[PDB]
């Protein structure tokens, strides 16, 4: 095309690669990456002008008609700068005004400009109503432009680079030339129509150019203005132009989306208008599909596994659809078109409904219509003021329609009161569930165990990054010397700086004076560069310890989360698919603002009274975690008040009632508004704290249980619905996690329920939360939504708008990163386009374009003015992205489900190996010696020519600057580390375990004589793990970055042209693929939306394997052989330590030395070591000792039976008998079967039966050589 002609010649040379015409050598990857950086970014929009094209979209000139920002911002109490709401009381986001007068010119680039420094100077010195008002708007408006990964200026550049040349047709017959043209896309046309305003000489100035410090805005010419809505409009169009070519969207559906963004840019406060229509497109398609007459298709017949608490699921065939299976629920059409009439977008509604009625049945084409319209929702991360993010949404107090009377409480027992039995509303079932769950902890002897107490203190440090240092406030009652620890360079956050100083002072001399106003929010100073964040003090989390534990007991028997890395893809996804099936219709119960719905006015007074009566069981004279027993003042009896001894477990509830009733002191110290700073209480829990938000899960199942059994079977007026509500049970019909959860209807009258009966149910359920202030976000759209994931007739609907192609959440005004951390954002950006299925070739074409810009880095040092790096092309191959073309074969045969690592590099060097031996037997001299896996052909010289070894070591090399102070100098290192060691080692019994562990292991390191100085995860790695997890967020010095930078170029250019000693041993194994395995599902049934036969690669994998993970003998390791660890030690690193020693034939003292290292008792270390075995272990868990693992891209598949009994260690008629793993097939076959699947999932097309053909050595030679490797590790 003429678009390809307009590209630069090195940039043309990479579009030939992305099309698949030529292999992508490293020289094309270097020159074109250098072409991106030296190019002015404004030249990218000139390339959009080089396409002559037309489509019916007109960008109005009414976008540029702006408001005045100073009319939109003012000052209120405590001298805070904020946005007064103009129209509606949630008008809080960025107003669309000119950034023009607020910016000065920039010294380096005269065309752009940052903030005028007179406004920057005085607003930190003198708090004005103009300058402080200006810097609030500027830093917020720059932040919403900063919400991208890199510039959308370049993200449009990769998309035009992919669309320059069409992809070449591979020999796989399921590919198609794409139906989409760039000429027909109104997304690209609206960007060109906007950019006609932004040129003065045909140069196309971008309105912003987001430097990694922050966005820098374009200066306006005289007569024209630069409003802030355009850069946000451009980002949303580029976010839509990328996805629509990846979702293969119709051009009549982009225009449906584009006209909403142009309407919101025409309106004022663009992000607020875009927020009010955040649920239009799912309501027009996903929430309402099949309400018409003609309905049919095929649906999965998923059955609940009849032991109900197991939460297991099995795909048990197909279900042909009919008009009794279409949703009885009313359509969401009438409430949605009224919302579109508020913004004059009623033609957007009638466009979808005309196209939705073209899909009467449930097919592959129908679910693609759902995800195409769900791609039209903007996934733009809205940023308001972090002051105003808390001043409104963390300020809403609930409305209790039925408050508890004061006569319903007993006399006080210290601070707390008990609930009288005379009141029997839903508060009683709240009071009686939290009481009996509190009884099962004073009985439970899991505590007063030194390892269990060490896990809980590890749980507060590791899980969240912490907020403040209120021990500077907690010197008010106890004289502390207060070490500032500037002689240790460590960050002063709540992770390390608090808990190390806690090891000196006991809790009882501290818990009486914990109540602080700068409890949380900012690092012990009222102005910094950080945002006000959620977690609180570690000793006020320690006084909140029983409230976590009683909430854990409620969620134990109901919510078997099992604390696994695969719990969304094992439990949530099949429940999503078991819901929305034509047998059962569901009510996806959501509880909005649940964190701001738990107060001491109703909830926290009941549970603290329930825990205190619940902890009355057991010993009243018993300490707990260092809090002793104490005297309470009983006032229940009016005639006999007295002093009672209460336990330490009841002592914590006395201080917790004082802390919950005073509230939670959020202190806002954001760096966005110029110096607004105030701490204030709230009744709002922290949001992301999973150890605290499990209390919301503890109330979600509990309050639904009183609804389904007592409240609604008595309150509802429908006599027919009382028959349904009789046998509903939350152990069968309700699943919760967090605030949201699925309600299930009983299988007898599930799909045959009247919608008039369901509307009377949900009216009573919405009125049921009015007794608590719980605003239920009930939906009745006959679709599933458990944790922000969707379904339609048992087809998973990947929300493409949830993971944006351009967007990225930044809670900081800066990115706070050195350059090569962008590469780890690339791989996460790639796999989100693989999980949420897209056009897998075009997404892989887009990924190599997007990764090519992330290959060069330039550092600015005042000492050294020049730094330039270059990762090779093969770096991204090791990290997970499959290559589009190898030299010597056809393109787009490597699947996106390829593993990363050595496991992925094995897969490419297997099918491409036959070319590598033949192409190196010619054109290269043979080896002087002999090589085991390639013979006399000089393949590792040829692999050195393509830079295979270059990108291999460049990917394995680290990409984050290590800190500069070490222990070899005269630095005082162990000031804060050894005090944190004293925090973890409180009891002398647990210290006697770990000193026994390292003494026995270092005795058995040399006596057993296999390793020396090898890393074994002891508990002394955990202060090394914690303190190094504090300096990773600290900005590194330029001495550390350049040392990290120079180590990159030394790692790339070094002559080590060998792989690791596992991949050198993997390449002996030659696997080969026979016919395709017989089918798991019927491919007429859509498993995941987007996996049609057009998107062929994702279509076979969900058809050959299936998306319901079959719980087998293996079940991909939900068990991890150590049920509880100190948080900081990876159990992945523990099973890869014990099972090696089981293979190596270690004495049982070697196991006990490892288990005493992690803190297990001597009674426990024997009892784990005999329990672990090589046969009782699982086939995935055996392969993890050789660093082979299931990738994240396989987690949504049913890899269970395929690794079990389709992958061959030994297919007896086909293979050669040199690969007989005799007496080693207990542990070599999990390696051999998983290397079979490592290559089966790499080849495109259907999943073939994989067979080990031969090993170049013996299989005994490989079992010997991995045994040499397992001794070295």
> What DSSP assignment string belongs to 341-352?
HTTT-HHHHHHH
**Minimum distance, C-beta of residue 1210 to other proteins, in the bound complex (Å):** 8
**Minimum distance, C-beta of residue 1220 to other proteins, in the bound complex (Å):** 5
Q: Tokens 């007429």 belong to which residue? A: 1084
Report the residue from 1225, 1253, 1258, 1265 that binds other proteins according to the rule CB under 8 A. Answer: 1225
Decide whether 187 or 1069 has the Cβ nearer to other proteins. Answer: 1069
Decide whether 537 or 1215 has the Cβ nearer to other proteins. Answer: 1215
**Minimum distance, C-beta of residue 1224 to other proteins, in the bound complex (Å):** 10
Q: Compute the CA torsion angle 123, 125, 129, 132 (nearest 10 deg).
A: 20
Number of residues that bind other proteins (CB under 8 A): 9
Q: Tokens 């508990």 belong to which residue? A: 1019
**Minimum distance, C-beta of residue 1211 to other proteins, in the bound complex (Å):** 8
> What DSSP assignment string belongs to 1230-1266?
HHHHHHHHHHHTTB-SSPEEEEEEEESS-HHHHHHHH
Long-range Cβ contacts of 675-680 (<8 Å, 24+ apart): 675/123, 675/124, 675/127, 675/132, 675/527, 676/78, 676/79, 676/80, 676/81, 676/82, 676/136, 676/387, 677/526, 677/527, 678/78, 678/80, 679/517, 679/518, 679/521
Separation of alpha carbons 1229 and 1205, rounded Å:
11
Separation of alpha carbons 1004 and 1146, rounded Å:
10
**Minimum distance, C-beta of residue 1057 to other proteins, in the bound complex (Å):** 36
Decide whether 748 or 1223 has the Cβ nearer to other proteins. Answer: 1223
**Minimum distance, C-beta of residue 1229 to other proteins, in the bound complex (Å):** 11
Decide whether 341 or 1214 has the Cβ nearer to other proteins. Answer: 1214
Decide whether 475 or 1174 has the Cβ nearer to other proteins. Answer: 1174
Half-sphere exposure of 1115 (CA within 13 A, CB side): 13
Separation of alpha carbons 1166 and 1105, rounded Å:
40
> What DSSP assignment string belongs to 315-336?
EEEEEE--TTTS--SPPSHHHH
Do residues 635 and 413 lie in contact, with contact meaning Cβ atoms separated by under 8 Å?
A: yes
Decide whether 1100 or 1210 has the Cβ nearer to other proteins. Answer: 1210
**Minimum distance, C-beta of residue 1236 to other proteins, in the bound complex (Å):** 18
Q: What residues from 330 to 349 belong to the interface with other proteins (CB under 8 A)?
A: none
Confirm or reject binding of residue 809 to other proteins (CB under 8 A).
no
Decide whether 1055 or 1212 has the Cβ nearer to other proteins. Answer: 1212
Rg over CA atoms, the chain: 32
Separation of alpha carbons 925 and 717, rounded Å:
90
Decide whether 524 or 1215 has the Cβ nearer to other proteins. Answer: 1215
Decide whether 850 or 1210 has the Cβ nearer to other proteins. Answer: 1210
Decide whether 940 or 1257 has the Cβ nearer to other proteins. Answer: 1257
- Helix or strand or coil: residue 937? coil
Confirm or reject binding of residue 1223 to other proteins (CB under 8 A).
yes
- Helix or strand or coil: residue 260? helix
**Minimum distance, C-beta of residue 1218 to other proteins, in the bound complex (Å):** 10
Surface-to-core class of residue 785, CB atoms within 10 Å of its CB (0-12 exposed, 13-18 middle, 19+ buried): buried
Q: Are strands 1069-1076 and 795-797 parallel, antiparallel or unpaired?
A: unpaired
Confirm or reject binding of residue 1075 to other proteins (CB under 8 A).
no
**Minimum distance, C-beta of residue 541 to other proteins, in the bound complex (Å):** 56
**Minimum distance, C-beta of residue 1247 to other proteins, in the bound complex (Å):** 23
Site string for other proteins, 1183-1222 (x = CB under 8 A): ---------------------------x-xx---x--xxx
> In 611-681, where do the E strands start and end?
630-634, 642-646, 666-668, 678-680
Decide whether 1018 or 1263 has the Cβ nearer to other proteins. Answer: 1263
**Minimum distance, C-beta of residue 1223 to other proteins, in the bound complex (Å):** 6
> What DSSP assignment string belongs to 113-159?
E-B-HHHHHHHHHS--SSHHHHHHHHHHHHHHHT-BSS-HHHHHHHH
**Minimum distance, C-beta of residue 808 to other proteins, in the bound complex (Å):** 53
Strand partners, 82: 74
Decide whether 862 or 1212 has the Cβ nearer to other proteins. Answer: 1212
**Minimum distance, C-beta of residue 1103 to other proteins, in the bound complex (Å):** 28
Residue 550: count other Cβ atoms within 10 Å of its Cβ. Answer: 25
Decide whether 503 or 1226 has the Cβ nearer to other proteins. Answer: 1226
**Minimum distance, C-beta of residue 1213 to other proteins, in the bound complex (Å):** 3
Residue 581: count other Cβ atoms within 10 Å of its Cβ. Answer: 22
**Minimum distance, C-beta of residue 1249 to other proteins, in the bound complex (Å):** 15
Do residues 419 and 608 lie in contact, with contact meaning Cβ atoms separated by under 8 Å?
A: no
Separation of alpha carbons 1195 and 1190, rounded Å:
7
Decide whether 718 or 1225 has the Cβ nearer to other proteins. Answer: 1225
Decide whether 766 or 1211 has the Cβ nearer to other proteins. Answer: 1211
Separation of alpha carbons 297 and 322, rounded Å:
8
**Minimum distance, C-beta of residue 1076 to other proteins, in the bound complex (Å):** 18
Separation of alpha carbons 9 and 232, rounded Å:
31
Decide whether 2 or 1223 has the Cβ nearer to other proteins. Answer: 1223
**Minimum distance, C-beta of residue 1217 to other proteins, in the bound complex (Å):** 4
Residue 190: enclosing H or E segment and its boundaries?
Answer: helix 186-194
Most distant CA pair in the chain: distance in Å?
104
Decide whether 788 or 1222 has the Cβ nearer to other proteins. Answer: 1222
Enumerate binding residues for other proteins (CB under 8 A).
1210, 1212-1213, 1217, 1220-1223, 1225
């Amino acid at each position: 095309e003429e678009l390809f002609n307009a590209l630069p010649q090195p940039l043309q040379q990479l579009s030939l690669a992305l099309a698949g015409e030529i292999p992508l050598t490293d020289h094309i990857f270097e020159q074109a990456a250098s072409t991106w950086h030296v190019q002015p970014r404004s030249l990218t929009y000139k390339l959009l002008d080089h396409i002559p094209f037309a489509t019916p979209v007109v960008v109005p000139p009414s976008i540029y008609h702006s408001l005045d920002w100073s009319k939109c911002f003012a000052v209120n109490q405590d001298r805070v700068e904020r946005i007064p709401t103009i129209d509606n009381p949630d008008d809080v986001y960025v107003p669309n005004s000119d950034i023009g007068p607020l910016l000065t010119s920039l010294h380096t680039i005269p065309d752009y400009g940052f903030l005028h420094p007179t406004i920057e100077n005085d607003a930190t010195t003198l708090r004005a109503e103009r300058a402080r008002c200006a810097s609030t708007f500027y830093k917020i408006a720059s932040s919403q432009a900063r919400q991208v990964k890199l510039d959308p200026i370049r993200m449009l550049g990769f998309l035009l680079l992919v669309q320059a040349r069409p992809r070449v047709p591979s020999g796989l017959v399921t590919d198609q030339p794409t139906r989409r043209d760039p000429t027909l896309s109104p997304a690209l046309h609206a960007i060109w129509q906007v950019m006609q305003y932004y040129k003065v000489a045909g140069v196309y100035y971008a309105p912003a150019l987001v430097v990694p410090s922050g966005a820098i805005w374009w200066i306006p010419p005289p007569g024209k203005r630069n409003v802030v809505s355009v850069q946000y409009l451009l980002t949303d169009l580029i976010s839509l132009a990328i996805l629509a070519h990846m979702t293969d969207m119709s051009p009549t559906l982009e225009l449906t989306g584009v006209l909403m963004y142009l309407r919101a840019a025409s309106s004022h406060s663009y992000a607020y208008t875009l927020l009010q229509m955040k649920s239009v497109f799912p309501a027009l398609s996903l929430r309402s599909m099949y309400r018409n007459k003609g309905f049919g298709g095929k649906a999965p017949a998923i059955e609940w596994t009849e032991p109900r608490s197991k939460y297991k699921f099995r795909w048990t065939g197909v279900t042909q659809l009919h008009d009794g299976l279409r949703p009885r629920s009313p359509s969401m059409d009438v409430p949605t078109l009224e919302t579109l009439a508020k913004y004059e977008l009623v033609d957007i509604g009638h466009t979808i409904i005309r196209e939705r009625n073209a899909h009467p049945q449930h097919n592959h084409d129908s679910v693609r219509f759902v995800r195409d319209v769900m791609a039209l929702t903007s996934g733009m991360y809205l940023v308001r003021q972090p002051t105003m993010s808390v001043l409104r949404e963390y300020s809403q107090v609930p409305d209790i329609k039925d408050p508890i009377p004061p006569s319903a409480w007993t006399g006080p027992i210290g601070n707390v009161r008990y609930l009288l039995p005379s009141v029997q509303g839903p508060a009683r079932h709240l009071y009686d569930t939290w009481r009996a769950a509190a009884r099962q902890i004073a009985q439970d002897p899991q505590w007063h165990d030194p390892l269990n107490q060490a896990i809980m203190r590890a749980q507060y440090v590791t899980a969240r990054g912490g907020s403040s240092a209120s021990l500077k406030f907690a010197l008010k009652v106890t004289g502390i010397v207060l070490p500032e620890y500037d002689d240790s360079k460590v960050k002063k956050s709540s992770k390390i700086y608090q808990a190390a100083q806690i090891a000196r002072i006991a809790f009882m001399l501290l818990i009486a004076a914990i109540h602080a106003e700068v409890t949380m929010g900012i690092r012990n100073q009222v102005q910094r560069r950080a945002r006000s964040i959620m977690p609180l003090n570690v000793i006020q989390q320690a006084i909140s310890a029983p409230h976590t534990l009683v909430a854990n007991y409620i969620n134990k028997h109901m919510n078997l989360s099992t604390t696994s890395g695969s719990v969304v893809t094992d439990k949530v996804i099949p429940l999503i698919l078991y819901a929305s099936t034509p047998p059962n219709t569901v009510v996806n119960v959501d509880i909005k603002a649940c964190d701001a719905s738990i107060t001491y006015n109703y909830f926290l007074s009941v549970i603290c009274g329930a825990m205190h009566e619940g902890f009355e069981v057991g010993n009243a004279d018993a300490a707990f975690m260092g809090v002793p027993s104490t005297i309470v003042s009983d006032r229940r009896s009016p005639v006999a008040p007295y002093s009672r001894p209460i336990s330490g477990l009841q002592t914590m509830v006395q201080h917790l009632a004082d802390l919950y009733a005073a509230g939670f002191r959020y202190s806002v110290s954001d760096a966005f508004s110029s110096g607004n700073k105030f701490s204030f209480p709230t009744s709002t829990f922290p949001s992301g704290s999973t150890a605290t938000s499990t209390e919301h899960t503890a109330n979600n199942s509990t309050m639904m249980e009183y609804f389904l059994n007592v409240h609604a079977p008595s309150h509802v007026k429908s006599a027919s619905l009382k028959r349904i509500l009789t046998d509903m049970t939350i152990q069968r019909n309700y699943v919760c996690q967090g605030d949201d959860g699925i309600l299930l209807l009983p299988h007898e009258a599930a799909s045959k329920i009247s919608a008039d009966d369901m509307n009377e149910l949900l009216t009573c359920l919405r009125d049921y939360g009015q007794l608590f202030g719980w605003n239920y976000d009930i939906d009745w759209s006959d679709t599933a939504e458990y944790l922000k994931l969707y379904a339609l007739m048992g087809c998973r609907i990947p929300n493409t708008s949830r993971h944006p192609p351009v967007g990225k959440e930044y809670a900081a005004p800066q990115t706070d990163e050195i350059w090569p951390s962008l590469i780890d954002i690339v791989i996460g950006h790639h796999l989100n386009g693989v999980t949420d299925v897209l056009n897998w070739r075009e997404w892989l074409r887009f990924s190599w374009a997007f990764a090519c810009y992330s290959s060069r880095g330039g550092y600015t040092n005042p000492r050294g003015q020049s730094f330039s790096a270059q990762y090779p092309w093969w770096t991204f191959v090791y990290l997970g992205i499959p290559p589009i073309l190898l030299p010597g074969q056809t393109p787009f045969i490597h699947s996106c489900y390829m593993p990363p690592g050595d496991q992925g590099m094995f897969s490419i060097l297997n099918g491409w190996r036959d070319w590598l031996i033949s192409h190196a037997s010619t054109t290269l001299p043979p080896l002087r010696h002999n090589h085991p896996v390639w013979g006399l052909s000089d393949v590792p010289s040829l692999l050195s020519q393509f830079g295979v070894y270059a990108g291999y070591h460049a990917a394995q090399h680290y990409r984050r600057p290590k800190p500069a102070p070490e222990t070899a100098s005269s630095d005082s290192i162990n000031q804060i580390t050894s005090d944190l060691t004293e925090y973890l080692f409180y009891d002398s019994a647990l210290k006697a375990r770990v000193m026994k562990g390292r003494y026995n292991w270092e005795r058995l390191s040399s006596s057993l004589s296999l390793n020396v100085g090898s890393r074994v995860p002891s508990l002394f790695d955990v202060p090394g793990k914690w303190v190094a997890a504090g300096r990773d967020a600290e900005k590194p010095p330029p001495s550390s970055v350049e040392d990290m930078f120079t180590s990159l170029n030394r790692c790339i250019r070094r002559p080590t042209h060998s792989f690791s000693r596992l991949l050198e041993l993997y390449l002996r194994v030659h696997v080969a693929l026979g016919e395709s395995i017989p089918l798991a599902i019927d491919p007429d049934v859509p498993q995941v939306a987007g996996a049609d036969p057009a998107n062929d690669d994702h279509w076979f994998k969900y058809t050959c394997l299936g998306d319901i993970p079959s719980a087998t003998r293996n079940y991909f390791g939900e068990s991890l052989f150590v049920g509880r660890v100190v948080s900081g030690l990876d159990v992945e690193a523990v099973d890869a330590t014990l099972l090696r020693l089981k293979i190596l034939g270690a004495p049982p003292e070697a196991f006990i030395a490892v288990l005493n290292g992690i803190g297990m008792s001597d009674s426990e270390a024997h009892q784990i070591a005999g329990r672990i075995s090589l046969a009782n272990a699982q086939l995935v868990q055996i392969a993890r000792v050789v660093h082979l693992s299931i990738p994240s891209s396989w987690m949504t598949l049913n890899t269970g039976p395929y690794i079990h009994h389709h992958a061959y260690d030994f297919k007896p008629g086909i293979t050669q008998p040199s690969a007989k793993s005799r007496d080693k097939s207990i542990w070599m076959s999990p390696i051999l079967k998983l290397l079979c699947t490592s290559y089966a999932m790499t080849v495109a097309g259907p999943v073939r039966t994989s067979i080990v053909t031969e090993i170049d050595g013996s299989a005994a030679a490989l079992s010997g050589n991995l045994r040499v490797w397992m001794r070295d590790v």
